[model samples]
Target: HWGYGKHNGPEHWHKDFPIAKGERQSPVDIDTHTAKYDPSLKPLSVSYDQATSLRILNNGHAFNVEFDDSQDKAVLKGGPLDGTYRLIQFHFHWGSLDGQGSEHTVDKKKYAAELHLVHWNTKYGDFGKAVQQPDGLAVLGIFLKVGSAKPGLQKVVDVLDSIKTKGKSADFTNFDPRGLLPESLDYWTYPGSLTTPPLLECVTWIVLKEPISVSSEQVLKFRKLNFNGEGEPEELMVDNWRPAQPLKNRQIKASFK
Candidate 1:
């Protein structure tokens, strides 16, 4: 139960959670105005069984999961992105209020939130070592929008009760992330850096075009987690997201048909 304050929010997350200082942080704003469309790239795939060994982590500011390859056996193939990359971790970025949840924006309109499924290219060995390499990371970005109802996200929300406390985490055994993905695989990709500190510029970003929806209540529930530790009452930690940056001459290619 972390206390909510202007200084105790996202601005302070990096102080408490060391990883927030990592070179590669996420939830960046993407602009299509300067993006280029590429039709030759193929789609990346993840099997259901390979998405299970996900280990959840409550780093105060966000809920991230470290993906284990031994259990999940996740792999990537085809596209301008042809290769095998293992799922490494997944996390989210949200806003302080229900209306503005997403960290990344397209033409300036914000969504409900954004979820990142991180992967490391096996070509560079394991995730720990790969993260340090220039071309060793790949991240799948999924946008979360507020809508009617979403049964898919319930799988994650169902376990929220167990980790409602800040810095608290549960096993989340045998859970698959495939269900949480949107039906449309169409995406825009580019070479970018991490959205957080240590802000390593060694990643290929794959952002999905379609977004999944969840109820406002669900969004509110996520905001209740603490940023400090247990014993602290759950405060609304919704605005734990970073603002999108400039593309800086980076080329964004898309995979359609």
Candidate 2:
């Protein structure tokens, strides 16, 4: 199975998924100095239904909070997106230590973790069909810094023990992801791809500049999750982030000055 281990990590992914080396791959370093400011970019518009949250599951690589997308109750619009995108799920990537974890770094500076709110364009029939289009996916990336406690983050951490092993899942509801955003919605955007395998080049990445606070204690709780499934030898889930891929002359536009 594809994993973050030496045998199946990002480096060897090209064997089965050759697109790992393809153009427009994700998690690229965001150099603030070079990212041009685009006045045309609109402020991001996000709305969610707290009750839309369904089950939380350990998907081996990371834990994800799946949401109901049968309707537009929870959606992301404006910013880099053309129409509206339905929120499907949200997940995180983290490192073993506080100094480094975030996938997309600013000026090469890493955060303790990163949150990805995955959305699929409604223009496409569904996520399955959206993945094949160039602009069918929009991922809102929020950096997570270790500092004061964030109650929204704690809500997620509270469920870690229930899903300590891969493939484990539990009921997760009445959770609204919107509360996790930082004060500012300013972001840097670019055309990118899925950070994970299958590595589809169909995402428009909108990464926020402000990082939300996540207590040091809370960050450690995520480590309790195991990459291995039940009955298998335990392997802690850490450093699940993908290394920055080549930018390849892709233009990164900023919504802020």
Candidate 3:
């Protein structure tokens, strides 16, 4: 299995997934000095049905919050997207310590953790099929700050104990995904790809400027999650994040100055 280990880590992934070295890789460094401020950029519009959240799973990588996005019930519009994109699921990447671990960086700053809300373009008709095209996906990247207990996140953490082992899962419902977003919709955007395996070049990334708070204690709880399943002994999930890739000659655009 591919992982963040010495033998099978990100550095070795290119051997199997050649797309990893493509020009449109993700989790890149956002150098604000070079990012252009576009006044005409449309503000992001997001809407979700609290009940669409179905189950949460521990797939030995990161925990996924699966949603029943069978229709256009919950979708994201505007902001670097063509047509609307449906919310399918969300996950995260984190480091072992406070100042590192997040996939993308702003001004060379790595937060304690980073969140990814994956979406598929409605124009393609289906999530699975949409992923093959150049504009197949849109990921909303939210940076998590270290501080308060974030009552909102406590709910997600509350269920972690039950899913401490890989392949373990439980239902997580009645929660609106929007409750997790930061107040400011201001963001930075660029063309990128999946940070994980297969690293497809089909994502238009929309990363928020402001970060949401997360308690130090809560952050520690996340470390307990194991990358191994029940049949095998589990290992600490530290540094499950991918390092920032080269920017090449791409230009990052911002919605706010």
Candidate 4:
């Protein structure tokens, strides 16, 4: 029942999911001017074996490039984490228009979109179970801006045509998602949640200081994707992002000043 629309939107989610009002909610305004630059924070260690990619799916809420997270092959280490976090899947949050979509913002400035690479801690042995604990998951958040056409994402966008409806999926392999990352590993870290329903407060947010480019054309393609099925009235799948929550008592640790 939760969506980006009026009646079923985020403001109404707290009525059904208590965690929507949880203390450590996600997508908080980064406010870099006030963020603490912690030199002790380790650089993020990420290694993803291209073969670990399973497929891409249209989940109505967002498009996810799912991975076979069965092993430690594709894992994230260091940087505000105690142990290894296996890469499970990656997805994005975007607005219906430019400058309005990104969940996390810097100094109150929003990006065109935001990409979240989700990983679960091996402590729980399963993604489902890990998401239930305090230190259960980690998400690498990369901001996307409209400038040059990103060649790396063309492969991802090309497949959107194959999965225009919810529940549709297609084979996507040999693609290195690292190609979508920024040149710098510098980021800000904090405790947060899933940003979606059942909004679990188990995520360690690692938001990159740098952003990558996406073309205006590519951004439009994302808007064209349907949230409904073929038989139903097509609902343009845009603005699939939650609004920023209160920082509460949390302090955002930055890898860069």
lDDT leaderboard ranking: 2, 4, 3, 1
> lDDT tens string, model 1, 170-245?
8866767786788888888877767655556777888888999888887777876666577776465567666665
Task: Report every candidate's CA lDDT.
Answer: 0.71, 0.93, 0.90, 0.90
TM-score against truth, every candidate: 0.85, 0.98, 0.97, 0.98
* Cα lDDT of model 4 by residue, 104-176, tens digit: 9998899999999999999899998999899999999999999999998998998899989989999987778
Which rank order by TM-score, best down to worst? 2, 4, 3, 1
What lDDT tens digits, residue by residue, belong to model 3 across residues 1-257? 69999999999999999989999999799998889999878989898754388999999989999988788878998987769899999988888999997999999999999999999998888888888998999999999989887777888888998898888999898767877889899999999999999899899999999999999998999998999888686689889999999988788999988
lDDT of 1: 0.71
Q: Which ten residues in a row have the lowest lDDT in candidate 3?
A: 45-54
Taking every candidate in turn, the Cα RMSD to the unseen true structure, in Å, is: 3.7, 0.9, 1.0, 1.0
Clash pairs detected, candidate 4: none
lDDT at residue 216 of model 3 (Cα atoms): 96
lDDT assessment of candidate 2: 0.93
Error of 3 at 63 (Å): 0.3
> Across residues 34-151, which tens digit of lDDT does each residue of candidate 2 receive?
9999999999998875339999999999999999999898899999789989999999999999999899999999999999999999989899999999999999999999989998
